[PDB]
Amino acid sequence: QVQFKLVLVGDGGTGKTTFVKRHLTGEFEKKYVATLGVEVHPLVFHTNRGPIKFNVWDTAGQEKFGGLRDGYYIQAQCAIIMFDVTSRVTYKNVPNWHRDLVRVCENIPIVLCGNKVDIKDRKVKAKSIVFHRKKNLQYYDISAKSNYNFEKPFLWLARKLIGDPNLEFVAMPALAPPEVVMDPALAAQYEHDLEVAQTTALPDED
């Protein structure tokens, strides 16, 4: 069971947390609730070379770049720098995040993500992006909301770390579910909720 410490970095409100949430739940959180300090979230993926786990360190975007946030970087093995395609300021800050990073990690795989490509009024067009050329980074347009390219970052990183340009995600063992017997005092009050659900409409996004 292989493990990789990945540092998730970027300005506030860019989608770092919403991104991680989708990968470990499938949901799309629409409420912005700032992250304090750092929150470590484990994500595993099954590949043709076995299961690998990324311990993602979702960091806070309000903390100034500096030696005070070295603990997050120390012993990292990869990283993701995020910015919002609808905010030029957010983009102008990338160079600062990518620097604070290499200051302690040096040479490690890093992918730059332009999030929110689903929004119409785009400011930072894919053409403009060049930073990845000067800094040897991989770039990706993504949308935690539509899922556009949402799995590329983890896939690219895995290939660089593992060393297989053709590594790919696969199945996932589908173990057998638990028994499920009971019924006595357990029954009844169930249908109470089942209604509270067959009534609440579903977010028509399709």
């Binding site: 292989v2 099954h46 043709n48 070379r49 076995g50 093995q77 060393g163 199945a171 063992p173 589908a174």
Partner: peptide
Amino acid sequence: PIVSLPEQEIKTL
């Protein structure tokens, strides 16, 4: 590469 992992065959179960 940071690690070397052998080709592997996973079952779908």
